Homo-oligomer: A and B are copies of this chain.
Amino acid sequence: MNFFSLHPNVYATGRPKGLIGMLENVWVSNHTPGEGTLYLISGFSNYNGGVRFYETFTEHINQGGRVIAILGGSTSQRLSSRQVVEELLNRGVEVHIINRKRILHAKLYGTSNNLGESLVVSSGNFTGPGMSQNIEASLLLDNNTTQSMGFSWNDMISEMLNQNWHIHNMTNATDASPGWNLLYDERTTNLTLDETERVTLIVTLGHADTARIQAAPGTTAGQGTQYFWLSKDSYDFFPPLTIRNRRGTKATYSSLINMNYIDINYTDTQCRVTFEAENNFDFRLGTGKLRYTGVAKSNDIAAITRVGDSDYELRIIKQGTPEHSQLDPYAVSFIGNRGKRFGYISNEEFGRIIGVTF
């Protein structure tokens, strides 16, 4: 069967609700690890664009499969990052970088094996924004439809490799490989946060989020892991999630960020945001600094405002207050199964609503 999605959460004809969902179909739900070849073609790429799938690629390759990535690169434009490429190569992905005045602009993903070809054509790059909040269209075609059309990955990739283009095969790259100069460094960011990044995440809180916050100081009810559970698809809202779990543990990808907890007048400069890549793909924010403080309870909202690449402010928006009534409608998308919702709002307008100039 074939599927179409316009994400985030706008329109979908079936089960897959966006690019992540389409790739989950072709690379997870309808794929056997180790069979054939996974393909990813994307003009732009960054680290958080791949966190959902690095483990997928690793198991596929560990089970005898191949992964081929063809990504854009440039000395004068930020297309694909060193970080994403480092990571793909380290998993055994075969990575080719195309350098061309008119860029590789295509975004195509899928698989080829003995059974047939699957194909996802998208507007979404293999980037955090492509996988998250950009308004993106994606179309998945199944084996029967690609067969009837005559589509072949092998034939297409063979043609791409015979155009005279400047294509750098980075598989087995060393430090000397000139392909590195086509890849930008995610750690290089502008002095001030771009206007497009100046947003606040609004999320409703539940009993998991707040039990240990409400717990009387020092009581056992307050003990244990204290997280705010955030949306599964927050790839674009956080810096590169490059901090990894210890060997032998479930795979996670994290960043340390500055979290200015406004309600207790305290900045945690080691606040951890974590993507759980071998559980249920949740984002979780380590909010242990709020343990026992009482600052939040179920049905309150957390407003997490991004003010720098890695700088954030957290405010509790208390239920039954005017601010909560104006912000609760912005949490439009459901997370999990107990009524949690989230969404984003500009900092400009969040501010307007709470009385703050950012």
Contact = CB atoms under 8 A, between A and B. Distances in A.
Contact of A123 (B76, B100, B107, B135): B107
B139 A139 contact: yes
A244 interface: no
Contact of A198 (B101, B130, B145): B101
Interface stretch (A47-55, A153-161, A203-211, A314-322): A153-161
Contact of A159 (B6, B107, B123): B6
A1 interface: yes
Interface residues of A, number: 55
Given A10-B156, A102-B236, A3 B149 contact: yes
Contacts of A299: none
A352 interface: no
Contact of A10 (B43, B122, B160): B160
A197 B108 CA distance: 26
Interface in A128-160: 129-130, 132-139, 141, 145, 148-151, 155-156, 159-160
A103 B129 CA distance: 9
A236 B105 CA distance: 15
B4 A149 contact: yes
B145 A2 contact: yes
A318 B193 CA distance: 54
A133 B102 contact: yes
B196 A148 contact: no
B101 A195 contact: yes
A108 B137 contact: yes
Contacts of A11: 155-156, 159-160
A76 B196 CA distance: 10
A135 B196 contact: no
Contacts of A107: 123, 137
A196 B100 CA distance: 8
A44 to B, nearest CB: 11
Contacts of A280: none
A107, A130, A155 interface centre (most CB from chain B within 10 Å): A107
Contact of A13 (B14, B121, B149, B196): B149
B121 A102 contact: no
Contact of A105 (B13, B136, B199): B136
9 nearest A-B residue pairs (beta carbon): A106-B137, A102-B133, A105-B134, A13-B150, A11-B156, A11-B159, A121-B139, A101-B196, A2-B149
